[PDB]
């Protein structure tokens, strides 16, 4: 919902770390024209956890929605944006003709045509130059036969062609050798007291009677123990009140 999408030649790769990711909010945005995913199971995405989730957004031609793939081959593929051979993510695209309502077109949308196709994955070659078309370097500017700049997208035919623009949001889920922090949401049930229950406080499983305690912990304490290494107190998150754990009768 940025409402100001970038161009395909300069994509705005945003990094996500230590978040809930609310995987139920992605498909509630709008009907998607292309919802192709990859070696990360979308039905099981909410259960897994990753270290960094890289989000990438750009706009392409309607015929280029089938170009964002590992086994890709095309203009946008080799010259503008390339996915690796082993890509673990999804590609979400929807109709953008209604958003780019401008009969003039050619505004704020440009792409690449030449100059070292098969660009390395996730590397932004935004450096603007002129391709060496001919022997003369043309002093780094336009001139005779050196008419090879990065081209713009002519989104002029508003509601006039089937090659309408589509906004693509590429998600790159990566799990490095580090403690993963972008996990799924963790549900929590209502607290009960004065009864034997099978509790689980932030991963601390046990069985006993939960009662209010007069003991005061330090602000960083989330675990109460006694002699013989027994678990006699907890922090009880979502309320921050200290509870006493006594074994069931």
């Amino acid at each position, epitope marked *: 919902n940025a409402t100001t999408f970038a161009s395909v030649y300069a994509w705005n790769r945003k990094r996500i770390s230590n978040c809930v990711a609310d995987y139920s909010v992605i498909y509630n945005f709008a009907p998607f024209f292309a*919802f*192709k995913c990859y070696g990360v199971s979308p039905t*099981k995405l909410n259960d897994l956890c990753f270290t960094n989730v890289y989000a990438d957004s750009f706009v392409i031609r309607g015929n280029e929605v089938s170009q964002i793939a590992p086994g890709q081959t095309g203009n946008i593929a080799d010259y503008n944006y390339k996915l690796p*051979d082993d890509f673990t993510g999804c590609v979400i695209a929807w109709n953008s003709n209604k958003l780019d309502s401008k009969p003039s077109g050619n505004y704020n949308y440009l792409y690449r045509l030449l100059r070292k196709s098969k660009l390395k994955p996730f590397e932004r070659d935004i450096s603007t130059e002129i391709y060496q078309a001919g022997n003369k370097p043309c002093n780094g500017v336009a001139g005779p036969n050196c008419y090879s700049p990065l081209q713009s997208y002519g989104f002029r035919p508003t509601y006039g062609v089937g090659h309408q623009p589509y906004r693509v949001v590429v998600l790159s889920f990566e799990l490095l050798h580090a403690p993963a922090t972008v996990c799924g949401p963790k549900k929590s049930t209502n607290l009960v007291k004065n009864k034997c229950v099978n509790f689980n406080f932030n991963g601390l499983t046990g069985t006993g009677v939960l009662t209010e305690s007069n003991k005061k912990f330090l602000p960083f304490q989330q675990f109460g123990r006694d002699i013989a290494d027994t678990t006699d107190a907890v922090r009880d998150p979502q309320t921050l009140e200290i509870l006493d754990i006594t074994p069931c009768s």
Partner: antibody
Amino acid sequence: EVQLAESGGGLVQPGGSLRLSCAASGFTFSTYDMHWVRQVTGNGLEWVSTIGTGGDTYYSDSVKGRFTVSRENAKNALFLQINGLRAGDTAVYYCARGGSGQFWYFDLWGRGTLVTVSS
Amino acid sequence: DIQMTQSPSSLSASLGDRVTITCRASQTIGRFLNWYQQKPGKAPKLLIYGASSLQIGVPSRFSGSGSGTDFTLTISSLQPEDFATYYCQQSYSMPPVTFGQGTRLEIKR
């Protein structure tokens, strides 16, 4: 035992509404994903649609836009509503379950149902 | 989008023979591939999943091999219950899953 039931396959006019049904038995239905795969007479298997544990739905290229898959956590009831059928949609549908793991594979298959669309 | 190319539609072999059903992919899919068996008189059933793991209940005569762009389902000794149709499926792009055209196993005489 463990098996998957099916019902609702039959003849329907082109473009008429149709709703298939699949009933599981023998396992925890609320913790496994379900898939729908068809097979045209003389052709191979063709994935139609699927629904995950979280209720999210997915369809194919020629399937999205006219199909509607649904699933209830209770009663082990699985459904697949279709609208706008055509002659090219005549195929043998199968109810399949998604096994555990990190990739889609059909570890359990149903009895299979036949669907024919003609006037 | 991903396409699969399996062995010819029919393979002729006798009892106890060795059959290596070959199925290739359009690009590198790693090990996200599974095999299935379908007798024309009943519903299909899986035999190999992940191209390396054998399904529980399947005899040890079936064996899956290959990865990336070429997969081969090798059978050591054909039995009367083995003659059926087989299909390979890629699982790299899970929403756009595609199946192979099929391969028939017939008795040689």
